[PDB]
């Protein structure tokens, strides 16, 4: 019966970002409630969230280790002799260094409970009794026995996402990337199924780590992978991934997955096509986990896609009851959920009202090679604006003339309404696209235009300083209509 | 007798500078261009040719071998991402290094030639140019103004853009030391090597060198102070020094050598002022760069020089003398080839174009690639704190993510904003480690458009990077009020 200024269900980037502020910036006295203390089978996140969990952490790790496979061919180019036949490698050494570091993050969020005072961790499910109890239970059955009942003047919901599986017969075959994180042994053969973030990541993961003879496959469903994303990057990108040993299988999806004997599974898709690989990945979206709050019991609404509906400020439609992060299902990355998290904890508790800004959002795909992107691509540009210049540049990067990497294609498209040179998105694809792309959201805040790229000096050789090399455009939409020319002077 | 090639524009020095005023204005304004060279392709003896030093002996083969050496970094990080292989089989080998690097700077070489055939208005022309009056500038055989002439050109207007050379110190022995530009062209990876300075080169070098000595081998750098890297921020001139050692070069503060003598064996035995001694198979000075105004036969015009031996240029890049033109390191103003590119196109648009424009110097982004490699942009903390009463400095030192796992725990990456604490504004952001040089570049673009800390902290940061600690900062680590450094501001 213990009662608290703010209970935060879900341990995660959003909820640990309000209950460290409410209890540290503002005095509060705060719960936080999670499933697990750290990653793992059973409930994959835990404490930390799915970021430290099975998301951002592990999976850049990972990419990093994947990245050696290029880093090791390529370094011949530079005179490095070995002996390329010793090399291997070794999964069960990459899962373990993974599963190390990982636990020491939540072993150092359990720390910061430990020494902060007014910020309590609960272990267990909870969910809503009422508009001010949050009830803790031992499993995620809601007649499961009561382990807490924390009174709340402030209730918030950060339970986040998790993985979709289509009702296809045999699903219970399939694997999604909870367990990915865990297999004991890394594909021979793998289907990764979806084209968007976390099908290309993992694409890229197992192509590294495969054993000898293996292939990864990626199969989605249309025409171009990475819908969302500038159309050249999504062309270049599915180029760069074919050169470097991945089957990129388009306008196909499975209908059906069959186990074999053996242990291996047997895909038929919609167009009667089969095949045989030893692990099926499927990454076809993330939806947010509000099955277990109960909400029923308060009347907590959900947007027909079953997101918990707020409004800017993340208010729900029941007073005191707040929810940020992918349990919106608004924009799903970690520094999103932690700037809705912050701005919540400053509204409720603080001087003035904020609300978390979700244009203009800098974001990544670890992809081998990886995008970096903010603001908007140019068919949404076009619509928009009466007028949009795309200015566009495609080089090999300088240590891809000597590397033996000719495939490796550097790409940087800036968009600007061309009436007045305003930036409204830039999009990289290439090694350093993700760290280059940071300060261009920054740049996005400040009005910046075309000129304020080029009239900046360059810092030679980078890949970068092409962003600032840019004059004349590439190409136009006057209207909606590409063309290559302006047809008229106004 | 017969008429010379007469030319609206003839530039002396086919580099960074000299190139991009050329092409500009023979592309952009029409112009009958001659452009001056003594090579045309990379190497000994000159060294730098057409393309300039950027291409032949600076930052393109730099780079390349830079990039050769961070992977003895990435052989020994790949194990701890599960990587195996025989570890006693690996061997850098220098000579296919260099190899391949000269082939790279050759195709650039063929490349300039090419735009020179295929560019109608632009020339180039082979030898020494000096200027022997207001509008004539001759082509010799040497660099010998009593050599031949093979040219004789009619010039309305004379670029200046000859760049500069390595400044070599006035001790006995000197002729047993080399320069950047013969340790491209080393026919052996030193074992023993010692990087005299502690500046870009021989920074940049001395990684080079450690990636790719024979086994047994050792770099040092040597510096005359007490800490490398002066106009760097502080922090970061500390933590480059020890993530140096942490690789196994040694840095000797303090020291300067006063003498080399050969030894029996051909090694080189270096005395130091201090009376210490180091034996070395090279000794590269790498202690700054000074204009190459020498060969310009100046005199017979009178372009005024600075008092630090500079072409003196205002802000147009206009020298003392009418339709004399002077950018890039010659006028010893950023040497930069970034910049040096900046001032050619800006004086050309203020001679033939329409439309007078001059190289805005402060707030250029650049970098040193050392192994971490430095990003930076704007001015340091010390002296911000000489010009604004309150100044705020931003400061984030961490591990980054792959380091917790890759065994280079020494490895630290460091973010800093230096603010003007009256409104916000940002005067200078340095970065250490992996993917300073290319998070640095967009900075660049913020502080032309004057933000302040709160637009980075507003930013929402990309996850996980290095880059995203620029816009995770909202409090001051420290001031200086006054000029005077304090933790927290007075009450
Ligand atoms: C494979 C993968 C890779 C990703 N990589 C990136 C990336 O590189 N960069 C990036 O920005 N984003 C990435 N993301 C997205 C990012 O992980 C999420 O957007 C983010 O973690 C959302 O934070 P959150 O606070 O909304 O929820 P979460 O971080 O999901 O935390 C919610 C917590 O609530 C707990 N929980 C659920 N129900 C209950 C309950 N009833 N009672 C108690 N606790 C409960 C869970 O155990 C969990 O720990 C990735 C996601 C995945 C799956
Ligand atoms: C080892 C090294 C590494 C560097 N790395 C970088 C880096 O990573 N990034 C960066 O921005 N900068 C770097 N720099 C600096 C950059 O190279 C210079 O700032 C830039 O090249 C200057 O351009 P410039 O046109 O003034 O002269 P240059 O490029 O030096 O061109 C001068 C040209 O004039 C020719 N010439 C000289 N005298 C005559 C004569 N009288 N007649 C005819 N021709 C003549 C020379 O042969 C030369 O080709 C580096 C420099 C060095 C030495
Ligand atoms: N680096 C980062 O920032 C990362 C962020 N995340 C976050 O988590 C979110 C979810 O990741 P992810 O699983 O890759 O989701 P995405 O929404 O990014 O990708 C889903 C993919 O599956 C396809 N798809 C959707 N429905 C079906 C279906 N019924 N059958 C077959 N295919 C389908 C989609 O195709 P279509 O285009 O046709 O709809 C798309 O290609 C990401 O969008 C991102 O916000 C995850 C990983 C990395
Ligand atoms: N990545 C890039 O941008 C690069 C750019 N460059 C450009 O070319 C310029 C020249 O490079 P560099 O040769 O490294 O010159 P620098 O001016 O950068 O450094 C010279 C070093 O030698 C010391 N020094 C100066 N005079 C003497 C002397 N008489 N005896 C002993 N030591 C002395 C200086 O110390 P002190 O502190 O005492 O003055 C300094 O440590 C750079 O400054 C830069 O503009 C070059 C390489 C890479
Ligand atoms: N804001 C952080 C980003 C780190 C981050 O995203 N952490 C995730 C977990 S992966 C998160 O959900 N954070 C919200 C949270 O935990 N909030 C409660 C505490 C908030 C205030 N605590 C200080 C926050 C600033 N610094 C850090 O949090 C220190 N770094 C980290 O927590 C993570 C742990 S995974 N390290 C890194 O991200 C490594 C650094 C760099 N990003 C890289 O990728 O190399 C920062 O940029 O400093
Ligand atoms: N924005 C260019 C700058 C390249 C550069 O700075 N080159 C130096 C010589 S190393 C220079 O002095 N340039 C002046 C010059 O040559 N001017 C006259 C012609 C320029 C007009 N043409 C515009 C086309 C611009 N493209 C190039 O000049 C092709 N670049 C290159 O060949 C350089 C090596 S010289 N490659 C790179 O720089 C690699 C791309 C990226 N910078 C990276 O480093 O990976 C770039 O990023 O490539």
């Given at each position: 019966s213990k009662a608290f200024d703010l209970v935060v269900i879900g341990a995660g980037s959003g909820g640990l970002e309000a209950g460290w502020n409410a209890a540290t910036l503002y005095g509060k006295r705060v719960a936080v409630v999670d499933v697990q203390t750290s990653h793992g089978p059973p409930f994959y996140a835990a404490l930390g969230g799915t970021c430290v969990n099975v998301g951002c952490v592990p999976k850049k790790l990972m990419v990093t280790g994947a990245q050696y496979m290029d880093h090791l061919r390529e370094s011949?180019?530079?005179?490095?002799?070995?002996?390329?036949?010793?090399?291997?490698?070794?999964?069960?050494?990459?899962?373990?260094?993974?599963?190390?570091?990982?636990?020491?993050?939540?072993k150092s969020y359990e720390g910061m409970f430990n020494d902060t005072e007014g910020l309590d961790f609960f272990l267990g499910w909870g969910s809503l009794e009422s508009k001010n109890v949050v009830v803790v239970r031992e499993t995620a059955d809601p007649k499961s026995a009561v382990k807490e009942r924390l009174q709340a003047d402030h209730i918030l919901l950060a339970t986040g996402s998790w993985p979709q599986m289509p009702a296809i017969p045999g699903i219970e075959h399939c694997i999604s990337s909870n367990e990915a994180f865990y297999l004991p042994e890394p594909p021979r053969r793998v289907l990764t199924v979806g084209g968007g973030f976390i099908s290309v990541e993992f694409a890229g993961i197992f192509n590294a780590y495969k054993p000898p003879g293996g292939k990864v496959t990626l199969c989605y469903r249309n025409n171009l992978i990475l819908r969302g994303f500038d159309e050249t990057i999504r062309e270049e990108v599915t180029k760069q991934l074919t050169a470097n040993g991945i089957e990129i299988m388009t306008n196909e999806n499975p209908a059906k997955v069959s186990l074999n004997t053996d242990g291996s599974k047997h895909v038929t898709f919609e167009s009667g096509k089969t095949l045989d690989v030893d692990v099926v990945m499927m990454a076809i979206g993330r939806i947010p986990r509000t099955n277990d709050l109960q909400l029923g019991n308060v009347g907590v609404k959900l947007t027909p896609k079953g997101g918990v509906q707020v409004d800017e400020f993340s208010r729900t439609n029941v007073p005191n009851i707040y929810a940020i992060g992918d349990i919106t299902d608004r924009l799903m990355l970690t520094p999103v959920a932690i700037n809705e998290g912050a701005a919540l904890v400053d509204t409720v508790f603080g001087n003035k009202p904020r609300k978390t800004d979700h244009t203009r959002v800098a974001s990544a795909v670890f992809s081998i090679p990886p995008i970096g992107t903010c603001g908007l691509i140019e068919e949404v540009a076009a619509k928009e604006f009466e007028k949009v210049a795309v200015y566009m540049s495609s080089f090999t990067p300088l240590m891809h003339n000597i590397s033996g990497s000719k495939y490796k294609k550097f790409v940087a498209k800036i968009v600007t309404n061309?009436?007045?040179?305003?930036?409204?998105?830039?999009?990289?694809?290439?090694?350093?696209?993700?760290?280059?792309?940071?300060?261009?959201?920054?740049?996005?805040?400040?009005?910046?235009?075309?000129?304020?790229?080029?009239?900046?000096?360059?810092?030679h050789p980078t890949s970068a300083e092409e962003l600032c090399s840019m004059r004349t455009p590439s190409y136009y939409y006057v209207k909606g209509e590409k063309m290559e020319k302006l047809p008229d002077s106004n």
């Amino acid at each position: 019966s213990k009662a608290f200024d703010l209970v935060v269900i879900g341990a995660g980037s959003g909820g640990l970002e309000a209950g460290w502020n409410a209890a540290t910036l503002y005095g509060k006295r705060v719960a936080v409630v999670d499933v697990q203390t750290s990653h793992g089978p059973p409930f994959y996140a835990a404490l930390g969230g799915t970021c430290v969990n099975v998301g951002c952490v592990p999976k850049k790790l990972m990419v990093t280790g994947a990245q050696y496979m290029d880093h090791l061919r390529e370094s011949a180019g530079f005179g490095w002799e070995f002996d390329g036949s010793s090399v291997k490698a070794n999964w069960k050494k990459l899962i373990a260094a993974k599963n190390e570091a990982v636990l020491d993050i939540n072993k150092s969020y359990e720390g910061m409970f430990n020494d902060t005072e007014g910020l309590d961790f609960f272990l267990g499910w909870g969910s809503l009794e009422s508009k001010n109890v949050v009830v803790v239970r031992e499993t995620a059955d809601p007649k499961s026995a009561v382990k807490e009942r924390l009174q709340a003047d402030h209730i918030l919901l950060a339970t986040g996402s998790w993985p979709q599986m289509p009702a296809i017969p045999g699903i219970e075959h399939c694997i999604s990337s909870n367990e990915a994180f865990y297999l004991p042994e890394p594909p021979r053969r793998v289907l990764t199924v979806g084209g968007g973030f976390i099908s290309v990541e993992f694409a890229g993961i197992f192509n590294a780590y495969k054993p000898p003879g293996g292939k990864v496959t990626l199969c989605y469903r249309n025409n171009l992978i990475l819908r969302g994303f500038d159309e050249t990057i999504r062309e270049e990108v599915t180029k760069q991934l074919t050169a470097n040993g991945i089957e990129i299988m388009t306008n196909e999806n499975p209908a059906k997955v069959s186990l074999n004997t053996d242990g291996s599974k047997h895909v038929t898709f919609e167009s009667g096509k089969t095949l045989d690989v030893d692990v099926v990945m499927m990454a076809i979206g993330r939806i947010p986990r509000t099955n277990d709050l109960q909400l029923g019991n308060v009347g907590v609404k959900l947007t027909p896609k079953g997101g918990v509906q707020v409004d800017e400020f993340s208010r729900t439609n029941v007073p005191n009851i707040y929810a940020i992060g992918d349990i919106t299902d608004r924009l799903m990355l970690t520094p999103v959920a932690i700037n809705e998290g912050a701005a919540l904890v400053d509204t409720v508790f603080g001087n003035k009202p904020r609300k978390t800004d979700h244009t203009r959002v800098a974001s990544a795909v670890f992809s081998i090679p990886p995008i970096g992107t903010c603001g908007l691509i140019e068919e949404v540009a076009a619509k928009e604006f009466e007028k949009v210049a795309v200015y566009m540049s495609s080089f090999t990067p300088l240590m891809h003339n000597i590397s033996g990497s000719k495939y490796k294609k550097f790409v940087a498209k800036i968009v600007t309404n061309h009436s007045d040179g305003t930036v409204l998105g830039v999009h990289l694809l290439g090694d350093g696209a993700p760290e280059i792309i940071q300060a261009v959201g920054v740049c996005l805040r400040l009005n910046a235009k075309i000129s304020d790229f080029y009239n900046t000096i360059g810092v030679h050789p980078t890949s970068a300083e092409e962003l600032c090399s840019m004059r004349t455009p590439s190409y136009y939409y006057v209207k909606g209509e590409k063309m290559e020319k302006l047809p008229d002077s106004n």
